[PDB]
């Protein structure tokens, strides 16, 4: 068995999306959703073709199946920043395997535009710095969608480094910070530079991080 | 209205431990019951049904046991790719999931060095002050940060982020940030991030003036 998933996208508050599962190689079938930072919840499920959904979305979302293409569907209307998830369907038994997952396909409710970010410097000074050691980062501020990536020195320097998940703001941007920790001996000799990408904004900047 | 409740939230052992997590119903639901695995990035994967049954291919290590309202899954000698989050799942009433425990590393104490970051000048420009608190490589995860402007408690104008166990050390470091308009910024002169940690004997702050 394999389960393809699709459908899933961006779209504005208030929008709609259908999801796709097909299926290849007695069913129940559901759909569960993980948001951001949060456990699984069960969301609809079809097992005569009997239909139930959570409370959570009763009255938005559509479970069905067409059995001549063996694929599932979820009708999503009147979609909410609180939507944002992955989707998952599973297929339960009703193979030696009881359950049948697909991957998922994610899903982003957000009026937000592509926008590559900020990179503002975290400069060492002796407010960061402790005992011989110095720390000092990027903060990467205000892009959509996910994700950037930060190296530091072009990828020559890898050890200490901190990149932190990045956290939605109520703007509806993104934000996230780079660090590293160094010898505070080296603030002089070595410099640091931290390289930001964001591949959907083709964003590519190089930025020197100066000990005050 | 099938409350699902897992005990712990986390967990923190060492290879080769005996490891059990519980999961309580809020009524009976006999032995319709699964545990599920999930790892970051990745669909759930099914480890036992009805309580205590198998599911295919899955190591013998993992066992289920319990009925009616208290459910307790057992693994009998942890291994490296077992460190992951675990759910149960009610089935007697569709599905609802418990909210997920976390089996995480075990190592010795390490209080967070606290390093401050005043917002750039650079930053400054586009309206927006942030002022970044950085607490690196501690041990346990829970840590409290709280942020006093000239004295005063803030609450409401920041967020965190923490990143996953380091793969070297089993440590965590953590983001806070602090957002306010350059106005609001403008009115106060100390800023104090306020650390509170198990390695700590008291609590660690890190300040400065602005513009000093
Ligand atoms: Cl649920």
């Known amino acids: 068995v394999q389960l393809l998933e699709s459908g899933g996208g961006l779209v504005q508050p208030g929008g709609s999306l259908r999801l796709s599962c097909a299926a290849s190689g007695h069913y129940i079938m559901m759909w569960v959703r993980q948001a951001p930072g949060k456990g699984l919840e069960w969301v609809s499920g079809?097992?005569?073709?009997?239909?139930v959904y959570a409370d959570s979305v009763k009255g938005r979302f559509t479970i069905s199946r067409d059995n001549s293409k063996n694929t599932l569907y979820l009708q999503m209307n009147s979609l909410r920043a609180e939507d944002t998830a992955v989707y998952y369907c599973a297929y339960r038994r009703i193979r030696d395997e009881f359950d049948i997952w697909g991957q998922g396909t994610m899903v982003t409710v957000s009026s937000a535009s592509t926008k590559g970010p900020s990179v503002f410097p975290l400069a060492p000074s002796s407010k960061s710095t402790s005992g011989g050691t110095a720390a000092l980062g990027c903060l990467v501020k205000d892009y959509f969608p996910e994700p950037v990536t930060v190296s530091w020195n072009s990828g020559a320097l890898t050890s200490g480094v901190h990149t932190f998940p990045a956290v939605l703001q109520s703007s509806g941007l993104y934000s996230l910070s780079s660090v590293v920790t160094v010898p505070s001996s080296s603030l002089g000799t070595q410099t640091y530079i931290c390289n930001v990408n964001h591949k959907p904004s083709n964003t590519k900047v190089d930025k020197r991080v100066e000990p005050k | 209205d099938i409350q699902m409740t897992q005990s712990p939230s986390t967990l923190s052992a060492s290879v080769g431990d005996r490891v059990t997590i519980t999961c309580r119903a809020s009524q009976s639901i006999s032995s319709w019951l699964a545990w599920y695995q999930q790892k970051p990035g990745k669909a759930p994967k099914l480890l036992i049904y009805?309580?205590?049954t198998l599911e295919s291919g899955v190591p013998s290590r993992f066992s289920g046991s319990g009925s009616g309202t208290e459910f307790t899954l057992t693994i009998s000698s942890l291994q490296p790719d077992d460190f992951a989050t675990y759910y149960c799942?009610?089935?007697?009433?569709?599905?609802?999931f418990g909210q997920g425990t976390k089996v995480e590393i075990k190592r010795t104490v390490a209080a967070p060095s606290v390093f401050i970051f005043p917002p750039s000048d650079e930053q400054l420009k586009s309206g927006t002050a942030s002022v970044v608190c950085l607490l690196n490589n501690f041990y346990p995860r829970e840590a409290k940060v709280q942020w006093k402007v000239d004295n005063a408690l803030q609450s409401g104008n920041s967020q965190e982020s923490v990143t996953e166990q380091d793969s070297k050390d089993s440590t965590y470091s953590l983001s806070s940030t602090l957002t306010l308009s350059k106005a609001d910024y403008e009115k106060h002169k100390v800023y104090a991030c306020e650390v509170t940690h198990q390695g700590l004997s008291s609590p660690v702050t890190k300040s400065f003036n602005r513009g000093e």
């Open positions: 009805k309580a205590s």
């Open positions: 799942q009610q089935y007697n009433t569709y599905w609802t």
């Open positions: 079809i097992y005569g073709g009997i239909t």
